[PDB]
Unconditional design. Structure first.
Lengths: 252, 249, 393, 252, 51
């Protein structure tokens, strides 16, 4: 009783279909998966080293989920101007209009330039996601459990910064479920926490205490596409939006 | 086009006869199906005796009745039922045990459940009354924290829903298949699943058009909701003493 | 083992693949899987039912408007005027400083794209009994400016395309909107917070009252009318841009004295280039010349300035929270931040320096905090705000 | 009544056609599109940083149009010697003899050498061109609107300066028109401003405040070819030209 | 997973393509489009008349 039509009072004629721009621009913008495989910024951070780190310590950690992180506006003094000004990207705006997903993701991590050190990246699909709080890029500041340490059995890859300071990887779907939730997650049970993100990506440097001083306050950006075999499987309508050019200007 | 009423009233009764329970409708149902028909999944994660009880579980049973009056504003929720919990909580709200209704006696003894649903939302409104309600189904309501800004008829019109007009006094049929992250919902306290037991989401009936009438018209009307579990499968035969009562809400 | 002696290849290197292309290429990756031929599957009941398709999203009705149509509405009273575009808004009456809006799904899926074209379909559901009798025009005027949004009645509407609907027993209809423009596509209504990119509708939809309502004395005198929007069978969008809409998950905006960006958190430590390591100065790191840098305060002749942190709990900590400081050129091409024990000392140091003194003067040195007060050398909480304390000098 | 001939008084004989140099040089210079696909300098600038920039701030901006920018002679003290001495290139000299165009463009941007930082390039086809004034390379000095910020949904690409400090990109035709104007544009209406350039290219660095000091006063050059599927569709005669070796010499 | 043990290639690197050639080569680019097979079109009345 949603898409019904009682009486269609057509006063129009036939309009020439362009095929979603394929006639004009040589490309059809109908398949939305083609749009979602364009990369979009997952996040950015400035590297900060509080305690003395070993070679095994991970530099930062983040859960890997397609509907985008908790929107990091930044500090009140120094806000991240991308997430503050133009609030959110295309891919989570599409993913807000669905409930469930199943499939892989694609992450492209861009490291700073003047660093040379060899970088390891692990994917741990063990970390359940406990609430929408702490669903963000987390600077590892201490090592108590096996979280900070480069572990053995996970899917890892090492990028040589001397050759190229960007890594391009594909995170697979490893949950034991039919789907996962595709909204701002509210933790009710313990089993529901296993089914939010695909896994948990930890990026670490092999630098020592002397070479880590050149890495402090350097930016690391993370981009993500949607991959392929990536299916959204329940239509949910959109939440209240916000208009972007109605936001106030930084007057002087 | 040629009316001729008699002692019967010149109508045409539509019947839903499902396991010795018969529902009658004068009007045509306004159906809405959110997802296609699910598959049985006893193959992949069960070795216990898996069997529905279609003679007692595919019956109709009321889970909510309420009074829609003219003192309700534009966007105001009337019902918000977490249906697999709402069946058991509607029985427990009548102050008895769950083993006194034949619809829910496998929930006392089994552990997990998967099956589709059929929801009938019947209004009893006068022909001169004017108003309209939504019957919107949402999968897994509690797993979204921004749903408190979502619960409105503007957002629920975007996903598919069933409209109930108070003038025609029509009826809303809701074919709800099983669509969840896990392929089974536990009926009781099970490992690493302590809260949100047997919750699949909220059927929430809100108002679009508030009930309008003359100065001396009939002020209120009644709405009754019936449920059916047709494509069920029960696995994990267990003791009934392990089962606990549902959260009251 | 023969020797290959022919001429080799002669490329051009680039550091990254197509960051924008996504359809007809094979993007190579370091897949974190175990099998190189392995992909993801959907067996067999967790299959996709909804294809990600813009023509499937825009074909879904979204409730955008409710209109009260009353008995005392005269012949020709305006019920609604709106814009013939997917960007039709319904404002929520919230108390937030930024207001949220309801949109149709066609408007949300058209916010991501620059240009749209095609027919729109407005479903009017008139909640009435079979004893209410009325008649209304849903009209449609081709392109109107803002000064032509007024001077509008039901009579100028009938010059353009219009549809007159009678309400006797069928209480719902669907008006399909023509697409009349000088341009094959149409640039969207809002920009990505670029206010010189605003564009109004191609055309304007109206709904007047042709014949007023005649209700019987046993029914109500007011009637609700719902207005639903979906993009019709000819609706289409092409060019992807930054979407002009944002989520309400984090509804927090930040409007634009502290350290220059990046030079925080900082702690009070020592530096061989500031009084030969004998006095505290704010540092953003422990390595060679990692000294925090600070903006130049605008100070006119006849005044001084020093700094007092707004929230002491956020201050760097030595033997005490460093809540007061003076900022002065280092001699190395940037300003340094020099903590003091208290505001009185800060005022006395600023007096000395803005009075013509130098950091190497004994009078200045005696107002610095000595190195033995570094203590734990705890960093500030982020980059906190300081009040600029001004005084006549 | 333009290419007519009343009486052709031929006193000549048959001259051997070389096929536009194909006989002598192995190549025919008849197709002018072959000439216009040779790269030619779109512009050059020295990078200057006034205020403290974030990672999101764009370093410079320029509209992308085939008939060449407003000819930047430079300052009176330090003039850009390419545009001052030999005034303008081949491609805008050809494009002056036409009225309308439709098609793509090709941009090759050469960055300085000693910089290492990772560079992003976005194409925004949203910016209408308001007058022939400010149709030039614009140093972004402040961020008020969403102009300075790296936005989400646009066609972007990131060049790794550590691998190679040159980017080679193709700007597509995305206007909703039949053509665009191919002269020195005079803004009459608001809709005519949408149909001058293809879009608006913004180039930004991901450097912080410490690494941006090595980037100040470094040159960035921008070259462009004409692409393919690029058609000029109305013959307009040429304007008054100027002879280049008649320009005065810098006497001492 | 066999091991490839033969001898690899032996190039010369250069940083930029043909800045002058424009006729009979296929110049690779980072096209800022969405479709890799997509080009520009002229339908059907906005066709070129002057070559």
């Amino acid at each position: 009783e949603e898409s019904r039509n009682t009486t269609v009072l057509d006063t129009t004629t036939t309009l020439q279909s362009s095929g979603f721009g394929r006639a004009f621009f040589g490309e059809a913008f109908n398949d939305l998966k083609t749009l979602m495989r364009r990369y979009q910024l997952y996040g950015q951070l400035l590297l900060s080293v509080t305690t003395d780190k070993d070679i095994d310590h991970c530099m930062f950690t983040f859960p890997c989920l397609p509907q985008g992180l908790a929107l990091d506006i930044g500090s009140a003094g120094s806000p991240h101007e991308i997430f503050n000004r133009c609030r959110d990207g295309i891919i989570p705006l599409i993913a807000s209009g669905y409930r469930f997903y199943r499939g892989d993701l694609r992450y492209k991590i861009v490291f700073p330039s003047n660093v040379n050190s060899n970088i390891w990246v692990q994917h741990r699909p063990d970390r359940r996601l406990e609430g929408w709080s702490a669903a963000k890029i987390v600077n590892c500041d201490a090592v108590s459990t096996g979280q900070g340490v480069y572990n053995h059995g996970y899917a890892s890859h090492i990028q040589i910064t001397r050759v190229n300071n960007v890594i391009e990887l594909e995170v697979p779907f490893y949950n034991a479920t039919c789907y996962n939730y595709l909204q701002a997650f509210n933790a009710s049970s313990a089993a529901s926490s296993y089914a939010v993100s695909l896994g948990e990506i930890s990026v670490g440097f092999q630098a020592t205490s002397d070479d880590i001083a050149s890495i402090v306050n350097k930016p690391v950006t993370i981009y993500y596409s949607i991959g392929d075999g990536m299916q959204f499987s329940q239509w949910v309508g959109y939440q209240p939006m916000m208009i972007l050019d109605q936001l106030p200007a930084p007057v002087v | 086009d040629n009316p001729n009423p008699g002692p019967d009233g010149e109508g045409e009764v539509e019947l839903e006869k499902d396991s010795n329970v018969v529902l009658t409708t004068q009007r045509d149902p306004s159906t809405s199906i959110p997802a296609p028909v699910s598959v049985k999944w006893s193959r992949w994660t069960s070795n216990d005796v898996v069997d529905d009880y279609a003679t007692i579980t595919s019956r109709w049973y009321q889970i909510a009745e309420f009074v829609w009056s003219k003192d309700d504003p534009f966007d105001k929720e009337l019902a918000r039922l977490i249906l697999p919990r709402a069946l058991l909580s509607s029985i427990e709200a009548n102050s008895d045990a769950i083993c006194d209704v034949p619809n829910t006696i496998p929930f006392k003894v089994h552990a997990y459940w998967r099956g589709d649903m059929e929801v009938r939302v019947q209004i009893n409104s006068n022909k001169f009354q004017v108003g309209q309600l939504q019957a919107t189904w949402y999968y897994s309501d509690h797993e979204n924290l921004n749903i408190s800004s979502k619960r409105s008829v503007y957002g629920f019109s975007q996903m598919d829903h069933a409209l109930i007009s108070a003038s025609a006094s029509n009826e809303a049929k809701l074919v709800i298949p099983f669509k969840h992250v896990y392929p089974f919902l536990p009926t009781r306290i099970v490992p690493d699943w302590t809260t949100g037991i047997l919750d699949m989401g909220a059927l929430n009936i809100r108002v679009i058009a508030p009930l309008r009438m003359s100065a001396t018209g009939p002020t209120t009307c009644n709405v009754v909701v019936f449920i059916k579990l047709n494509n069920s499968e029960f696995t994990g035969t267990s003791s009934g003493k392990f089962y606990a009562s549902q959260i009251r809400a | 083992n023969p020797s290959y002696q022919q001429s080799p290849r002669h490329f051009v290197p680039t550091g990254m693949h197509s960051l924008a292309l996504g359809t007809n290429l094979v993007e190579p990756l370091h897949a974190l899987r175990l099998d190189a031929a392995g992909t993801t599957q959907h067996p067999v009941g967790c299959a996709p039912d909804e294809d990600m398709t813009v023509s499937s999203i825009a074909s879904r009705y979204g409730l955008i408007r409710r209109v009260q149509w009353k008995k005392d509405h005269a012949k020709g009273s305006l019920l609604l005027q709106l814009d013939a575009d997917p960007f039709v808004e319904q404002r929520i009456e919230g108390t937030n400083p930024i207001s949220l809006y309801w949109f149709a799904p066609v408007g949300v899926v058209s916010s991501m794209f620059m240009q749209w074209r095609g027919s729109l379909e407005y479903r009017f559901d008139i909640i009435a009994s079979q004893f209410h009798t009325g008649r209304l025009i849903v009209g449609y005027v081709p392109g109107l400016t803002a000064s032509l949004q007024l001077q509008m009645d039901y009579m100028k509407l009938k010059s353009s395309s219009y549809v007159v609907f009678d309400l006797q027993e069928s209480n719902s209809f669907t008006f399909e909107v023509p697409y009349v423009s000088y341009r094959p596509w149409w640039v969207r209504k809002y920009g990505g917070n670029y206010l010189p990119s605003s564009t109004d509708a191609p055309s304007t939809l109206f709904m007047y009252v042709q014949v007023p309502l005649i209700p019987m004395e046993a029914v109500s005198d007011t009637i609700d009318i719902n207005v639903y929007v979906r993009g019709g069978s000819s609706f289409e969008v092409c060019v992807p841009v930054q979407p002009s809409l944002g989520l309400n998950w984090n509804t927090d905006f930040i409007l634009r004295y502290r350290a220059k960006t990046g030079y925080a958190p900082y702690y009070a430590g020592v530096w061989h280039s500031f009084n030969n390591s004998n006095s505290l100065v704010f540092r953003w790191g422990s390595a060679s010349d990692q000294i925090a840098q600070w903006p130049t305060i605008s100070v006119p002749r006849g005044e001084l300035a020093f700094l007092r942190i707004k929230d002491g709990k956020q201050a760097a900590v030595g033997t005490q929270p460093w809540r007061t400081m003076v900022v002065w050129p280092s001699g190395h091409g940037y300003n340094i931040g020099i903590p003091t024990y208290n505001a009185e000392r800060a005022r006395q140091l600023a007096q000395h320096l803005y009075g013509g003194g130098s950091l190497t003067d004994e009078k200045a040195k005696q107002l610095f905090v000595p190195a033995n007060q570094q203590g734990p050398g705890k960093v500030s909480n982020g980059n906190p705000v300081w009040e600029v304390m001004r005084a006549p000098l």
